[PDB]
Design a protein around this motif. Structure first.
Motif, short mmCIF file in Angstrom:
data_model
loop_
_atom_site.label_atom_id
_atom_site.label_comp_id
_atom_site.label_asym_id
_atom_site.label_seq_id
_atom_site.Cartn_x
_atom_site.Cartn_y
_atom_site.Cartn_z
N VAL C 54 0.85 -1.18 0.00
CA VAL C 54 0.00 0.00 0.00
C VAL C 54 0.89 1.24 0.00
O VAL C 54 1.82 1.34 0.80
N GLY C 55 0.60 2.17 -0.90
CA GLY C 55 1.24 3.48 -0.88
C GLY C 55 0.47 4.47 -0.03
O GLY C 55 -0.57 4.98 -0.45
N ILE C 65 4.84 9.77 -0.51
CA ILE C 65 4.12 8.51 -0.56
C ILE C 65 5.01 7.46 0.10
O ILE C 65 5.93 6.92 -0.52
N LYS C 67 5.75 3.73 1.91
CA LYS C 67 5.48 2.38 1.43
C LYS C 67 5.19 1.48 2.63
O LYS C 67 6.00 1.41 3.56
N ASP C 87 15.44 2.65 1.50
CA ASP C 87 15.14 3.10 0.15
C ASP C 87 15.21 1.94 -0.83
O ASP C 87 16.17 1.16 -0.83
N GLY C 88 14.19 1.83 -1.68
CA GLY C 88 14.18 0.83 -2.73
C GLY C 88 14.03 -0.59 -2.25
O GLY C 88 14.39 -1.52 -2.98
N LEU C 90 11.06 -1.95 -1.24
CA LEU C 90 9.74 -2.51 -1.52
C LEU C 90 9.83 -3.58 -2.60
O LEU C 90 9.02 -4.52 -2.62
N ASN C 91 10.81 -3.47 -3.50
CA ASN C 91 10.95 -4.41 -4.61
C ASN C 91 11.42 -5.78 -4.14
O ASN C 91 11.20 -6.78 -4.82
N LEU C 132 19.88 -6.99 2.54
CA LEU C 132 19.35 -6.82 1.18
C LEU C 132 19.54 -5.39 0.68
O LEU C 132 19.69 -5.17 -0.52
N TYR C 133 19.55 -4.42 1.59
CA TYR C 133 19.81 -3.04 1.22
C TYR C 133 21.30 -2.82 0.97
O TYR C 133 21.69 -2.10 0.04
N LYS C 134 22.16 -3.42 1.80
CA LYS C 134 23.60 -3.23 1.65
C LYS C 134 24.14 -4.01 0.46
O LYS C 134 25.16 -3.63 -0.13
#
Ligand SMILES: [Mg+2]
Ligand SMILES: [Mg+2]
Ligand SMILES: [Mg+2]
Ligand SMILES: [Mg+2]
Ligand SMILES: [Mg+2]
Ligand SMILES: [Mg+2]
Ligand SMILES: [Mg+2]
Ligand SMILES: [Mg+2]
Ligand SMILES: [Mg+2]
Ligand SMILES: [Mg+2]
Ligand SMILES: [Mg+2]
Ligand SMILES: [Mg+2]
Ligand SMILES: [Mg+2]
Ligand SMILES: [Mg+2]
Ligand SMILES: [Mg+2]
Ligand SMILES: [Mg+2]
Ligand SMILES: [Mg+2]
Lengths: 76, 185, 141, 124, 55
Positions: C54-55, C65, C67, C87-88, C90-91, C132-134
């Motif tokens: 959901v945004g 917006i 997440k 950041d990034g 959600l994918n 997963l972000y790093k």
RNA sequence: CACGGGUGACGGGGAAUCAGGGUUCGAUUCCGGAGAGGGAGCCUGAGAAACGGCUACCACAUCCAAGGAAGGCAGCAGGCGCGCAAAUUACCCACUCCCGACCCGGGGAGGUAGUGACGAAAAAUAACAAUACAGGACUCUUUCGAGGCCCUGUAAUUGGAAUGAGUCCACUUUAAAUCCUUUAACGAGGAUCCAUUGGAGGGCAAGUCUGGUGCCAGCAGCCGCGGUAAUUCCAGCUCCAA
């Protein structure tokens, strides 16, 4: 196909559920060094394989035993 | 029901404010003066000083000519004399409160080796302690936090199993001698 | 103290025992209504199933917006608008995955620009969202 | 260059032995073996080394001192009378059996099942 | 909308990390910290600049 | 403040935080209570309403020839499920004691090992010397500059001197082993044998540095930053906290 120990048991259950009509189930157990045992299963079309190490035999053998007792039935 | 101790205690207590500039200034001066490894080395001596000062305040809250007060005061003065921070003529339970972290860090075996002068620098003395070249009363001390007693102060020297003392030379010297003899023939 | 008698112990104790319940932290800590309203049920972390993403629009002056993920829990079955922190990321979170859900440090309260979000996501399918972000570990496919 | 001194000397007539704490100084080498300890105690106390039993060495830091306990029996018959079988088997006059403990428990639980004379016939 | 996820993280320029001499650690790092704080500098007039101060 | 109800309440010695006062926890190695899926009844026995004792009912479940029989890991290991959440289906009665007809037998009590960053204590990842440089107490010089009795730091500049971490014969350790300590022989110049975890507007120590994004992505525990010169995002460099 080399898989995880749990994924091997799920695909082995799917092999019996596919062979509820026709087809053989082949289970090959052998020593493996490269303590580990190689356990492989074959229906004739799709092969699956795993390597069971010493760290997981107590977790593996009991569910494998219940899987065999639930999935194998012969003549009365 | 197993047979073991379960007895332990934190020797250090962190300060309440994490980023005091004057506190970091004082601790950084202490480390740069006496050759320390971290802030925990400051904080554990600060907490032992807190123990000693709390015992001193607990004795000064007691009445004069109390037997527990006299026994604990004489025992604590004996401990301060034998660690050698407080003088043997100065020994009185009112002078314990006027004692300092610098005078506690002066009795470090690293600092005492630096003051006796057998090592060049304070951190070089710590290197010698790590590399086991010095001994105290025929006993090799590998750890620089050894509180040297006043009676055991004069027995600090090089160990017997030491190339800097009377012993076999080190690995680099043996390798260079072997390389030189191999090049010579 | 107002009544300073020599034997007013039960009076002072009963008055303080009546007046402790008007404190906000005491009443929330000692009534079970807040523990029932809490989706964790007195838990630090919680696993749950992703069902939709959901945004969520932001509040006053800061406008963006954010997440969020509609996490359905396992221990209760309740729904949490959990927050995707970095950041990034959600994918990485796909549909029908088990994610670990923690608080946000205000002890069950909405924080800043995001309305009606108390909780966030730490781990994704036994692989941490920080790694997963790093870029250290990879999502198991 | 190995030196052995004795402390806490005691004569147990009720155990028919001598006992002491052994302090070994050995600069320039490792921990000396128990055979050399028994030989040096034998040439010290003018007795045969067969009765001297030494165990429990702890080496101090630095590497110039060990502490171990040792007893000196009167005879080998008295040593076998009161000396533990494991420290006898350390030297080799006694040999314990090789029957493993879990298989002994399994053999006992199998003999528990069958009643009668056939308890001996269950085993092998 | 959720189509703009990872936009700036995708479109920033990927700068490679510069190779660097390894830093001294522990007691030697704290000693080098003490040396760059106290024994090098001199008392100067005016407001003293910070460690990361640049112009 | 009886009675009733709730307890995410076994009680205590005690644990944490602490000025003085208090608050919270205590299932957890010691003492006492209760129990062996839920209750109930009983033989034996000094001592049980015992469940590694039986007898009936309920829930769960095994074999069967369909007449019948047999079960209780909130024990040691280990498994399924439940989960944010928790270890080896090991060795031994040698240390501690316990029981028996007893110096001799047994003890998953207990001891020792395997996992283990719950936690606590100590604590490696460099040091020294020589060059250039940048400076501080003296002498000299109006300053600029110079001599070193005294120094302090820096620079992938060079040099030997010393050691573990590892490898590994041998003792020692131990019921048999493992680890520690000892000890030969190897083993370090980017000593690549490379220490990370968070932040750099304020609280709060620490860039008005550079490039991109342009209220979008995102950062932000609080105030707030981002609407095309971001000290607050994303990357590089630098620095700060441990
Ligand atoms: Mg209740
Ligand atoms: Mg209790
Ligand atoms: Mg409970
Ligand atoms: Mg009972
Ligand atoms: Mg019963
Ligand atoms: Mg019982
Ligand atoms: Mg049982
Ligand atoms: Mg855990
Ligand atoms: Mg025993
Ligand atoms: Mg016995
Ligand atoms: Mg036990
Ligand atoms: Mg390292
Ligand atoms: Mg930045
Ligand atoms: Mg800040
Ligand atoms: Mg600041
Ligand atoms: Mg606001
Ligand atoms: Mg900030």
């Amino acid at each position: 196909v080399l898989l995880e120990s749990e994924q091997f048991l799920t695909e082995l259950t799917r092999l019996f559920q596919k062979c509820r009509t026709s087809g053989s189930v082949y289970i090959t157990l052998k020593k493996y060094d490269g303590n580990k045992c190689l356990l492989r299963a074959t229906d004739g079309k799709k092969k699956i394989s795993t390597v069971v190490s010493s760290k997981e035999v107590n977790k593996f053998q009991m569910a494998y035993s219940n899987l065999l007792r639930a999935n194998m039935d012969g003549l009365k | 029901p197993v047979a073991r101790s379960w007895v332990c205690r934190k020797t250090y207590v962190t300060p309440r404010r994490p980023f005091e500039k004057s506190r970091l200034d004082q601790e950084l001066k202490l480390i740069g003066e006496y050759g320390l490894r971290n802030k925990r080395e400051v904080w554990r001596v600060k907490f032992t000083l807190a123990k000693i000062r709390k015992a001193a305040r607990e004795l000064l809250t007691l009445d004069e000519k109390d037997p527990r007060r006299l026994f604990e005061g004489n025992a604590l003065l004996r401990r301060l004399v034998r660690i050698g921070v407080l003088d043997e003529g100065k020994m009185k339970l009112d002078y314990i409160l006027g004692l300092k972290i610098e005078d506690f860090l002066e009795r470090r075996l690293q600092t005492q080796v630096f003051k006796l002068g057998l090592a060049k620098s304070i951190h070089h003395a710590r290197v010698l302690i790590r590399q086991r070249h010095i001994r105290v009363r025929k006993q090799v001390v590998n750890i620089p936090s050894f509180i040297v007693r006043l009676d055991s102060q004069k027995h600090i020297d090089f160990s017997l199993r030491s190339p800097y003392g009377g012993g076999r030379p080190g690995r680099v010297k043996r390798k260079n001698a072997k390389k030189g003899q191999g090049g010579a023939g | 103290g107002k009544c300073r008698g020599l034997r007013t112990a039960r009076k002072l104790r009963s008055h303080r025992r009546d007046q402790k319940w008007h404190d906000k932290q005491y009443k929330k800590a000692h009534l079970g209504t807040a523990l029932k309203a809490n989706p964790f049920g007195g838990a630090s972390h919680a696993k749950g199933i992703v069902l939709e993403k959901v945004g969520v629009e932001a509040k006053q002056p800061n406008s963006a917006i954010r997440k969020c993920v509609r996490v359905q829990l396992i221990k209760n079955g309740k729904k949490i608008t959990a927050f995707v922190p970095n950041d990034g990321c959600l994918n990485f979170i796909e549909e029908n995955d088990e994610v670990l859900v923690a608080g946000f440090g205000r002890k069950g309260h909405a924080v800043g620009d995001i309305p009606g979000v108390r909780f966030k996501v730490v781990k994704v399918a036994n692989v941490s969202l920080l790694a997963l972000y790093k870029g250290k570990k990879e999502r198991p496919r | 260059t190995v030196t052995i001194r004795t402390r806490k000397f005691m004569t147990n007539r009720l155990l028919q032995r001598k006992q002491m704490v052994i302090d070994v100084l050995h600069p320039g080498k490792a921990t000396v073996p128990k055979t050399e300890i028994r030989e040096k105690l034998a040439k010290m106390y003018k007795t045969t080394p067969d009765v001297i039993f030494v165990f429990g060495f702890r080496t101090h830091f630095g590497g110039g001192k060990t502490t171990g306990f040792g007893m000196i029996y009167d005879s080998l018959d008295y040593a076998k009378k009161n000396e533990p079988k494991h420290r006898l088997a350390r030297h080799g006059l006694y040999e314990k059996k090789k029957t493993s403990r879990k298989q002994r428990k399994e053999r006992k639980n199998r003999m528990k099942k069958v009643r009668g004379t056939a308890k001996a016939n269950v085993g092998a | 909308s959720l189509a703009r996820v990872g936009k700036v993280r995708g479109q920033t320029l990927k700068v490679a990390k510069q190779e660097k001499k390894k830093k001294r650690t522990g007691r030697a790092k704290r000693r080098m910290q003490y040396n760059r704080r106290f024994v090098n500098v001199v008392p100067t007039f005016g407001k003293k600049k910070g460690p990361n101060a640049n112009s």
